[PDB]
């Protein structure tokens with residue numbers, strides 16, 4: 054069946070106050086079927102709150118929209134982010150990699166989530182031995198958001214624990 058609706062949503066910040074449900078939909082329908090699309094407004098004045106959300110039919114459509122950033126909607130570059138599972142970071146902790154996992158193992162796996170800028174395999178300050186964890190820094194937060202919602206990460210045969218790093 055369908056992926057959970059929460060994983061199909063994009064929170065769009067930085068909207069022009071002139072953006073409407075209809076203009077937000079017309080824009081974001083370029084990357085998939087929208088089952089929902091709302092501009093948040095004040096309950097009394099109806100003036101835009103400057104943000105809204107869109108819900109796609111599939112996760113692949115969310116990916117397509119994110120890959121099409123930057124989005125200029127009604128003349129203003131907006132800020133789409135996947136729904137919270139927002140702590141917006143570009144770096145992950147990767148644990149459980151033991152002593153045999155190398156840079157290329159992490160690169161070959163994680164490069165399919167986003168563009169990697171730094172891989173830091175952690176070693177012991179005294180002995181230089183690998184400590185069994187690493188940090189990966191990407192050029193953009195959506196890579197991290199995609200990573201941390203997965204139930205599982207398998208790298209170099211290890212089932213890894215992956216979390217946002219700050």
Ligand SMILES: CC(C)N(C)S(=O)(=O)N1CCO[C@H](C)C1
Nearest residue numbers: 145146147148186216217218219
């Ligand atoms: C040993 C490991 C489990 N940590 C406690 S960490 O390496 O300090 N680490 C640094 C902060 O970001 C990560 C989420 C956590």
